[PDB]
Amino acid sequence: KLPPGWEKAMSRSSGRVYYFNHITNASQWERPSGEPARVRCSHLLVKHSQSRRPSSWRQEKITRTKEEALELINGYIQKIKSGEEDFESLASQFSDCSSAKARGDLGAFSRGQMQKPFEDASFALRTGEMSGPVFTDSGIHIILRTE
Ligand SMILES: OCc1ccc2c(c1)OCO2
Ligand SMILES: OCc1ccc2c(c1)OCO2
8 A cells, every 4th residue: 555664644733644654764744655785875873872882073972861862863853854954964063973074975785784773764765765763773863865
């Protein structure tokens, strides 16, 4: 009936149906559209105190909690979806990954090289599409599939 990982849901505040993806944590109002050996993605990572390594080029010692990291990820997604901010601009200023220097770009990758929640969400995105919060042992990611 629907592409991989999508399900219908109901808005609590409006009562309108929307669509949610349980692999990429994306959600949207309109019915979704329509696998490759490699995909190319960029991401914005916000680390927290239970990250596998709680440090980044932004902070010698990352102290925020998982919940606070999710709040920051959530706000970045809001500004991206309203057009007030561009994904690349936010990944460059605020991503806790060294790939901030490349506007969040990671290059092309195949299955079996990334942390697996990241991998599954990347390959479940369509080209040009962005995820919601995706959780790994590094922290919380926003993923943009560029190829
Ligand atoms: O952390 C991984 C990583 C991937 C691509 C990059 C990078 C870091 O920095 C320059 O481009
Ligand atoms: O495997 C997923 C993944 C990709 C790139 C990353 C990362 C995790 O942590 C920071 O850079």
